[PDB]
Design a protein around this ligand. Sequence first.
Ligand SMILES: *C(=C)C1=C(C)[C@@H](Cc2[nH]c(/C=C3N=C(/C=C4\NC(=O)[C@H](C)[C@H]4[C@@H](*)C)C(C)=C\3CCC(=O)O)c(CCC(=O)O)c2C)NC1=O
Ligand SMILES: *C(=C)C1=C(C)[C@@H](Cc2[nH]c(/C=C3N=C(/C=C4\NC(=O)[C@H](C)[C@H]4[C@@H](*)C)C(C)=C\3CCC(=O)O)c(CCC(=O)O)c2C)NC1=O
Ligand SMILES: *C(=C)C1=C(C)[C@@H](Cc2[nH]c(/C=C3N=C(/C=C4\NC(=O)[C@H](C)[C@H]4[C@@H](*)C)C(C)=C\3CCC(=O)O)c(CCC(=O)O)c2C)NC1=O
Ligand SMILES: *C(=C)C1=C(C)[C@@H](Cc2[nH]c(/C=C3N=C(/C=C4\NC(=O)[C@H](C)[C@H]4[C@@H](*)C)C(C)=C\3CCC(=O)O)c(CCC(=O)O)c2C)NC1=O
Ligand SMILES: *[C@@H](C)[C@H]1/C(=C/C2=NC(=C\c3[nH]c(C[C@H]4NC(=O)C(C=C)=C4C)c(C)c3CCC(=O)O)/C(CCC(=O)O)=C2C)NC(=O)[C@@H]1C
Ligand SMILES: *[C@@H](C)[C@H]1/C(=C/C2=NC(=C\c3[nH]c(C[C@H]4NC(=O)C(C=C)=C4C)c(C)c3CCC(=O)O)/C(CCC(=O)O)=C2C)NC(=O)[C@@H]1C
Ligand SMILES: *[C@@H](C)[C@H]1/C(=C/C2=NC(=C\c3[nH]c(C[C@H]4NC(=O)C(C=C)=C4C)c(C)c3CCC(=O)O)/C(CCC(=O)O)=C2C)NC(=O)[C@@H]1C
Ligand SMILES: *[C@@H](C)[C@H]1/C(=C/C2=NC(=C\c3[nH]c(C[C@H]4NC(=O)C(C=C)=C4C)c(C)c3CCC(=O)O)/C(CCC(=O)O)=C2C)NC(=O)[C@@H]1C
Ligand SMILES: *[C@H](C)[C@H]1/C(=C/C2=NC(=C\c3[nH]c(C[C@H]4NC(=O)C(C=C)=C4C)c(C)c3CCC(=O)O)/C(CCC(=O)O)=C2C)NC(=O)[C@@H]1C
Ligand SMILES: *[C@H](C)[C@H]1/C(=C/C2=NC(=C\c3[nH]c(C[C@H]4NC(=O)C(C=C)=C4C)c(C)c3CCC(=O)O)/C(CCC(=O)O)=C2C)NC(=O)[C@@H]1C
Ligand SMILES: *[C@H](C)[C@H]1/C(=C/C2=NC(=C\c3[nH]c(C[C@H]4NC(=O)C(C=C)=C4C)c(C)c3CCC(=O)O)/C(CCC(=O)O)=C2C)NC(=O)[C@@H]1C
Ligand SMILES: *[C@H](C)[C@H]1/C(=C/C2=NC(=C\c3[nH]c(C[C@H]4NC(=O)C(C=C)=C4C)c(C)c3CCC(=O)O)/C(CCC(=O)O)=C2C)NC(=O)[C@@H]1C
Ligand SMILES: *[C@H](C)[C@H]1/C(=C/C2=NC(=C\c3[nH]c(C[C@H]4NC(=O)C(C=C)=C4C)c(C)c3CCC(=O)O)/C(CCC(=O)O)=C2C)NC(=O)[C@@H]1C
Ligand SMILES: *[C@H](C)[C@H]1/C(=C/C2=NC(=C\c3[nH]c(C[C@H]4NC(=O)C(C=C)=C4C)c(C)c3CCC(=O)O)/C(CCC(=O)O)=C2C)NC(=O)[C@@H]1C
Lengths: 184, 184, 184, 184, 164, 164, 164, 164
Amino acid sequence: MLDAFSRAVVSADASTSTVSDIAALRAFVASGNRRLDAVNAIASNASCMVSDAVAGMICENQGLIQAGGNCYPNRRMAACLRDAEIILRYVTYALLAGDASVLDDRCLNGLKETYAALGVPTTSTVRAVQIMKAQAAAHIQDTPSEARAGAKLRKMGSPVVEDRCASLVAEASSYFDRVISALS
Amino acid sequence: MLDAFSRAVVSADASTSTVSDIAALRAFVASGNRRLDAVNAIASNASCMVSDAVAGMICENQGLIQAGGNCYPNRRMAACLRDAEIILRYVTYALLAGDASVLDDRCLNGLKETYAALGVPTTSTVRAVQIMKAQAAAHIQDTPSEARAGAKLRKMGSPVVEDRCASLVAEASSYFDRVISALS
Amino acid sequence: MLDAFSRAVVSADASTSTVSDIAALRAFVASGNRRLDAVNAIASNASCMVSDAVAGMICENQGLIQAGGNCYPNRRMAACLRDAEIILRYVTYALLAGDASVLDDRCLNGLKETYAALGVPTTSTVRAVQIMKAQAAAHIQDTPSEARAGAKLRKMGSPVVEDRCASLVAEASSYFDRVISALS
Amino acid sequence: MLDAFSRAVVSADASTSTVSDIAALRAFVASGNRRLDAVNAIASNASCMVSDAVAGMICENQGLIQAGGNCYPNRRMAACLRDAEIILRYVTYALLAGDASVLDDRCLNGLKETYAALGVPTTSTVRAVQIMKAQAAAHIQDTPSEARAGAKLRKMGSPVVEDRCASLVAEASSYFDRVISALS
Amino acid sequence: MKSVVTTVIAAADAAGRFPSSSDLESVQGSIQRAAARLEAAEKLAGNIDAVATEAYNACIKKYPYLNNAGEANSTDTFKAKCARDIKHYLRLIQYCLVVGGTGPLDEWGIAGQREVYRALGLPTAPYVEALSFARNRGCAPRDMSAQALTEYNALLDYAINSLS
Amino acid sequence: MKSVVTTVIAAADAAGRFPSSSDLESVQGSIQRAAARLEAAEKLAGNIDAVATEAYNACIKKYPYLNNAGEANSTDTFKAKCARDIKHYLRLIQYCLVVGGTGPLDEWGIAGQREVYRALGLPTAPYVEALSFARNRGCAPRDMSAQALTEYNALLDYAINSLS
Amino acid sequence: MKSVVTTVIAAADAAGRFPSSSDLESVQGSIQRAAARLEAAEKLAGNIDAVATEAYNACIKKYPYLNNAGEANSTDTFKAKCARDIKHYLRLIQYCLVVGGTGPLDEWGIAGQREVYRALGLPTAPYVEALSFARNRGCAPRDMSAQALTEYNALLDYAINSLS
Amino acid sequence: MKSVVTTVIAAADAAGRFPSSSDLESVQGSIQRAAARLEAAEKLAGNIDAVATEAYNACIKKYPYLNNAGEANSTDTFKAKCARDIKHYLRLIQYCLVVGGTGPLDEWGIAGQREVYRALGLPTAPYVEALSFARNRGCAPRDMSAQALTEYNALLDYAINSLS
Ligand SMILES: *C(=C)C1=C(C)[C@@H](Cc2[nH]c(/C=C3N=C(/C=C4\NC(=O)[C@H](C)[C@H]4[C@@H](*)C)C(C)=C\3CCC(=O)O)c(CCC(=O)O)c2C)NC1=O
Ligand SMILES: *C(=C)C1=C(C)[C@@H](Cc2[nH]c(/C=C3N=C(/C=C4\NC(=O)[C@H](C)[C@H]4[C@@H](*)C)C(C)=C\3CCC(=O)O)c(CCC(=O)O)c2C)NC1=O
Ligand SMILES: *C(=C)C1=C(C)[C@@H](Cc2[nH]c(/C=C3N=C(/C=C4\NC(=O)[C@H](C)[C@H]4[C@@H](*)C)C(C)=C\3CCC(=O)O)c(CCC(=O)O)c2C)NC1=O
Ligand SMILES: *C(=C)C1=C(C)[C@@H](Cc2[nH]c(/C=C3N=C(/C=C4\NC(=O)[C@H](C)[C@H]4[C@@H](*)C)C(C)=C\3CCC(=O)O)c(CCC(=O)O)c2C)NC1=O
Ligand SMILES: *[C@@H](C)[C@H]1/C(=C/C2=NC(=C\c3[nH]c(C[C@H]4NC(=O)C(C=C)=C4C)c(C)c3CCC(=O)O)/C(CCC(=O)O)=C2C)NC(=O)[C@@H]1C
Ligand SMILES: *[C@@H](C)[C@H]1/C(=C/C2=NC(=C\c3[nH]c(C[C@H]4NC(=O)C(C=C)=C4C)c(C)c3CCC(=O)O)/C(CCC(=O)O)=C2C)NC(=O)[C@@H]1C
Ligand SMILES: *[C@@H](C)[C@H]1/C(=C/C2=NC(=C\c3[nH]c(C[C@H]4NC(=O)C(C=C)=C4C)c(C)c3CCC(=O)O)/C(CCC(=O)O)=C2C)NC(=O)[C@@H]1C
Ligand SMILES: *[C@@H](C)[C@H]1/C(=C/C2=NC(=C\c3[nH]c(C[C@H]4NC(=O)C(C=C)=C4C)c(C)c3CCC(=O)O)/C(CCC(=O)O)=C2C)NC(=O)[C@@H]1C
Ligand SMILES: *[C@H](C)[C@H]1/C(=C/C2=NC(=C\c3[nH]c(C[C@H]4NC(=O)C(C=C)=C4C)c(C)c3CCC(=O)O)/C(CCC(=O)O)=C2C)NC(=O)[C@@H]1C
Ligand SMILES: *[C@H](C)[C@H]1/C(=C/C2=NC(=C\c3[nH]c(C[C@H]4NC(=O)C(C=C)=C4C)c(C)c3CCC(=O)O)/C(CCC(=O)O)=C2C)NC(=O)[C@@H]1C
Ligand SMILES: *[C@H](C)[C@H]1/C(=C/C2=NC(=C\c3[nH]c(C[C@H]4NC(=O)C(C=C)=C4C)c(C)c3CCC(=O)O)/C(CCC(=O)O)=C2C)NC(=O)[C@@H]1C
Ligand SMILES: *[C@H](C)[C@H]1/C(=C/C2=NC(=C\c3[nH]c(C[C@H]4NC(=O)C(C=C)=C4C)c(C)c3CCC(=O)O)/C(CCC(=O)O)=C2C)NC(=O)[C@@H]1C
Ligand SMILES: *[C@H](C)[C@H]1/C(=C/C2=NC(=C\c3[nH]c(C[C@H]4NC(=O)C(C=C)=C4C)c(C)c3CCC(=O)O)/C(CCC(=O)O)=C2C)NC(=O)[C@@H]1C
Ligand SMILES: *[C@H](C)[C@H]1/C(=C/C2=NC(=C\c3[nH]c(C[C@H]4NC(=O)C(C=C)=C4C)c(C)c3CCC(=O)O)/C(CCC(=O)O)=C2C)NC(=O)[C@@H]1C
């Protein structure tokens, strides 16, 4: 897999050149601490995110838990909870690395074809991923609503800036969007 | 494994010396054709030798085919016919190579301990190997008796000398004797 | 232990048969005196053989008498001289008996495992045994070289035949080869 | 495996107690940078250390490269260079972790029995490890002599203190001494 | 026992490698972070009984049915075992703060926890409530520095995730 | 491509784990060490031709037999390829300083180097002398900070070790 | 130890077969070829010191830099070891001619040769030059019969290939 | 298809080896032995019908019960198939003499023979008697040279062994 820095190396090697834009690399390093806060915000809340995302997918489409639905019976609901956790894990890896290589290569490559072969609905999966994308955005910004969390609300206590890591939110969101693109 | 020639090399390498006794190696080569006749005499008659040897062991000890005997039931008789053929195969390899290494390393190493663990009688096995040793001697000399062969008598038609390859008979017999020593 | 004659008895007892090949036994008896000459030639020269064999092993591998070598210090050199004499003693017993049983049972059984456990080099031991094998061949034939003996040269004065007991030389050599096989 | 910190945890868990000596843990952390210098000094010079250590073992015991010696022929010299590098690797792991567990469990457990079974001299191995222990001490202190290095001399340029990391030298030396104890 | 240094050594060993640039660099991370997590480890060592007691009391306050005859907090032995279990989790978290990894919690708390609780009919919700209370309780700089509390909260969330 | 973050992610993935305490802690090490190695990376990017040229000149000065007819430095093409090879190693070292691991050197320089040099009858000693010269050349603070030079020297020693 | 007879026995053993038509036929090849290769083996046994010495002298004549302080032929010990190594290769070739296979050269010369030479900074070129000199030196019928020299040259080329 | 050359190539390929001394030496054995086995192959090609017919007639003479209603030689189709089968074995033996190995007999005659005869209730003894008759019939130099007849007899004994 690549990270943000080995991505710059691979790009440079296409012209057998040294990496000369050290300023960009220094910018990556300066956002290092906030990046670690963003990964900690997702990993620390992953169980709440997965169960809420899969429950949300199901409350919007009740057929998933009726005759012939793909979260029926118990075995399929369990398999689906597992897949939502796996996808979220590979997205958190990509955010920690600052590069989608690990997500693309180890999770998304052949996912659509696997789901096609199993009869797993890509539509309903895309909805679960949309909810996790929204959850991740809120946890990175440390602004989860009490309305959607109730007694499960968590505050991370990262040091606040005005933009609330808008750039990391966009990056995280772009990784979830690669999942959605891979299934769409 | 070693053959007669690589045996001379391994002996020489113990003093990091060249092999100087080329006369002995030329003597090995000069008996090459009769050695091939000796291997052909055993291989060509191996089924007759094995069945006669195992049948002989049994006609001398009837307990092998009675309650609790080690050629009872069908599975054990079959396993014993297989072992007599295996032992004869490794002895023929040793005769073709002019060295016991292949017999020692691939057949005899741990054989007694295996037989002890299975309850295979080493005494009765030694008798089967004695008969194969006698059969091999006769086939190498191209002097099988009609009395022991009946309608199964075979003649190889190798070119006769007065000694009838006494040296190859002794060598073949010494390999069968390594089997007997390994089980005794 | 067995001798050549009780070896024929044990072989016969595998078919509860009498020993019928009295001719072979008469052949053993006819070589009796030359066999006693062969044992006398080794026993009478044993100290010269052991010290020359161990000294030869050492002049070919100087590490045995340097830091970490297995003939260092004095205690280990003494232990090694003792082992070369023990091995030569069991080989002379085998030659007197016309059977390897005493050598196999009382000397070679567990020798490799003992040497492994002590850190005694089996390679260097094999070289000492090779030299004793060559020495024994020359003493049996009563043809030791002045080049290797100098002032220690001994002549036994056995009654000479043209072959110089080739068959006893081969037999003695085969016993030394069992030692080498047991350590290889 | 354990490191210095999980060693304190395992000790505490024997009485299901919290780790209370945080001062000692803070002391480990305060020597962290010099520990990284010590590991860098060995890793950076490992090829020079291994070849010099094995060459040293050999120049003190010439039998290792003569008939029957355990660095003869090419295959055995290569295997021995590999083992010296492996041992040095596990010692550097132990120094990086501040604990011998990885060395004990992954390198030393069954090493003597393996060497006994192969005929690898533990004496000569102990001498190779002694030389690597001396090399490591000098590289950690950044005081390799020109006399032992010649044109291969390296300087690390770590910030000098009067004691030259005597405590890390003793620790590194104690790991090499576990190797020697395991082979003695 | 998973830590920064055991992770890089295990990866180096699988590839037959000496420690290299990335291995030493990883351990520099421990040198920077140790102060924060050893601050948390020392606070928790000092006050574990009070921290565990209030977490235990929180989970029984949420699930008073546990006090009814035949339920998991209904006898003096059960009450003592439940409080002990909360202290066990906090002691394993103290170990994780010392080590800078989940190793102690992974090997001594989480492995087998669900088999044990299922076999004895112990509901998991009170365990989750106790840890969840502990997770929401702390604040910086009152209890410890922001980074010390970050490390403590992450290990509580890790235990919570293992039960969820 | 081996770096701090790819090593901890690969170890996390092999065990099916989210990033945890030890993973983030490892990456904090990169945040601390990056200044030193990016200083080295920038110096090397700025001056690679001069650094490579003097290392090439050092190895030919040590082994002038390479200039004889049929030897590896004997034609204009050979001379240009040899100097190019030294610059290749230094460019891969620049990449390792950017990444904070041996990945680029492992994958693009070291893998196959021995098969190539053996097949073309290229002696290894001149490569070792060039890198060894570069390793002994630098000093701080003249060329760069002590920690920048430590990073650079460690990667040169790593390449030297790969050829030794 | 690879020879005609060990090769056919190993193939027979893998399939559980007695020696058959093709096995005996293969060994007839050894009976025909033995005279030629034993002629070569006897010549080499008789004259190995002279053959090895002139090959050693050839490689030092080609690479006189080896005589300079710190280089591989620069001390009396180094000179003696280098000449010894050439004799080792020729002794292993004598063994191959006795056996009629590469077994002795495979197991005792070639396996580990590159690890050893790399570890001690021994250049491979002088080894190749010594064997290459020996390969080009012989002629028939001066030195031995055409087929004896064919067998000798093939084993020298085999060693050369292993180092190239 | 097992022969001298396919055996040494398969052993070379398993170890990633070019043909070497022992491979060529093995093939020299084929060059020496081919005259004998091609003499046998040509005789058998020339006279296979007569050789097969007398072997078939021998096995029915030994086992006249085969002529009884419901037995394996009792109809015109059965009689023709039995004689055909003997000719099949002799044709595969002709192929083995051409190739200098048991390959053709192994792959096309022996593999499955026992499953076929068992499934159709064909007794093995008549096949053995036919081949055994053919094995005892020949003499040199009447029928062919001693070595030609040795090759032919060895392949008959090999087929007999496969059925015994
Ligand atoms: C069905 C009746 C149904 C649902 C189930 C539910 C699903 C849902 N959830 C979100 C958004 C969020 N939920 C979050 C989850 C958590 N917050 C926490 O603090 C804990 C740790 C965790 C678990 C409870 C979060 C953080 C969000 C993000 C927004 C916010 O905080 O308000 C959505 C919205 C997704 C979208 O915008 O597309 C949905 C649908 N909703 C249901 O109707
Ligand atoms: C049981 C009552 C009983 C036996 C069964 C039989 C076993 C036996 N066989 C021999 C000796 C030989 N048998 C040979 C076999 C064959 N000869 C052939 O020509 C065909 C091809 C082949 C298979 C039938 C041979 C060659 C010999 C060698 C001696 C000879 O030819 O006469 C023995 C003797 C064992 C010994 O000498 O110790 C025995 C016991 N005998 C039974 O009593
Ligand atoms: C080291 C420098 C060194 C040796 C020491 C020596 C060892 C060696 N010895 C032989 C062969 C023989 N030595 C013999 C001993 C004796 N002959 C006598 O008459 C007396 C009683 C006795 C003691 C001195 C004998 C008999 C032989 C046999 C051969 C012969 O007589 O020539 C060898 C040869 C080994 C071999 O052939 O494998 C060796 C190496 N040699 C040394 O280099
Ligand atoms: C054989 C004749 C022979 C040797 C080979 C040699 C072995 C030996 N080496 C030491 C001690 C050291 N060698 C070191 C190696 C190096 N120094 C460097 O700067 C480079 C990078 C590296 C490789 C060449 C080092 C650092 C030491 C430590 C001591 C020192 O620096 O002086 C010893 C001594 C062993 C002991 O003390 O027990 C030996 C024996 N010596 C030979 O005789
Ligand atoms: C969006 C992600 C957040 C946000 C994050 C910020 N964190 C900042 C600083 C900071 N965070 C940490 C913790 C972090 N570093 C580590 O080493 C580890 C674990 C090993 C973690 C979890 C540290 C140490 C620091 C630096 C010290 C400090 O500043 O207190 C931070 C400030 C720096 C910056 O501007 O980049 C930010 C912005 N802030 C937000 O507003 C949302 C909620
Ligand atoms: C004891 C073994 C025998 C015996 C054998 C003899 N055969 C002799 C020569 C010989 N044999 C063959 C066949 C052999 N060579 C091969 O290449 C193959 C198969 C691939 C085989 C099976 C040949 C070709 C020859 C040489 C030609 C010839 O001489 O006719 C032989 C004579 C030479 C010698 O003295 O060694 C002997 C003695 N003879 C006996 O008395 C017993 C029965
Ligand atoms: C190789 C071993 C020899 C060799 C030996 C021969 N000795 C022969 C006969 C012989 N030897 C003795 C002495 C012997 N018998 C004893 O009772 C004792 C001691 C108690 C010993 C040591 C005697 C009495 C005899 C018989 C009398 C005589 O023939 O002078 C001998 C000749 C008979 C035969 O062919 O076996 C031989 C060959 N001869 C050699 O060439 C080497 C050196
Ligand atoms: C015995 C080991 C040495 C010695 C070492 C010292 N180095 C000290 C400080 C120091 N070292 C480094 C480099 C190190 N830190 C890393 O993060 C990495 C790589 C990832 C490495 C290799 C740093 C950054 C520092 C701290 C900065 C500085 O103090 O210059 C050091 C001084 C502190 C202390 O007393 O521990 C020492 C003693 N010194 C010796 O005398 C021998 C040769
Ligand atoms: C026949 C002369 C015996 C006899 C033989 C039995 N052997 C049995 C099985 C068996 N044999 C071996 C050794 C064999 N396998 C090899 O691979 C090799 C050498 C390469 C040899 C020589 C093994 C390992 C086994 C175990 C495997 C199996 O059971 O098939 C056997 C069956 C024992 C049982 O399971 O009860 C028998 C009966 N039995 C006799 O009474 C005569 C003396
Ligand atoms: C000399 C050729 C060797 C060598 C030999 C050493 N052997 C050592 C001791 C030792 N040897 C044996 C086996 C021996 N004892 C017997 O009773 C029998 C046979 C019946 C034999 C052949 C034993 C059991 C022992 C251990 C007890 C004892 O000390 O006697 C030995 C000393 C080992 C040590 O303590 O380090 C040595 C040096 N050493 C060599 O380097 C060459 C190759
Ligand atoms: C060098 C200082 C020695 C020496 C070493 C030899 N070792 C040989 C092989 C060998 N070594 C080991 C242990 C090693 N392997 C591991 O994985 C580890 C730890 C993780 C270690 C420390 C093993 C298991 C083996 C067997 C595998 C193999 O043969 O490659 C060896 C070859 C022995 C042989 O086959 O004859 C040697 C020569 N030899 C010396 O003389 C010095 C003292
Ligand atoms: C930030 C101001 C919070 C807040 C904090 C309060 N916690 C109170 C007491 C308290 N907290 C703990 C847990 C704490 N002690 C430790 O040793 C550790 C970690 C190792 C932690 C996390 C305990 C055991 C206690 C009782 C003992 C004490 O008084 O320190 C507390 C006191 C009043 C109360 O009990 O609520 C406060 C104010 N409370 C808040 O509202 C903000 C958000
Ligand atoms: C510390 C004062 C040393 C020392 C250093 C000197 N180096 C000199 C010249 C020089 N160094 C390099 C390599 C250097 N430049 C880089 O860009 C990098 C890496 C990016 C490194 C490591 C070059 C290319 C040059 C030549 C160009 C220049 O003048 O900078 C130097 C000048 C004298 C000379 O050329 O020999 C010095 C003094 N010299 C010492 O002895 C101490 C220990
Ligand atoms: C064919 C006529 C060649 C040729 C041959 C020459 N070689 C000369 C001497 C020589 N050759 C060797 C190697 C040789 N000796 C062996 O024992 C073996 C193989 C086992 C071989 C291949 C040696 C050691 C020597 C020196 C001793 C001697 O004189 O025999 C040689 C003599 C003159 C010279 O040294 O050049 C010649 C003529 N030379 C040719 O030009 C053609 C092509």
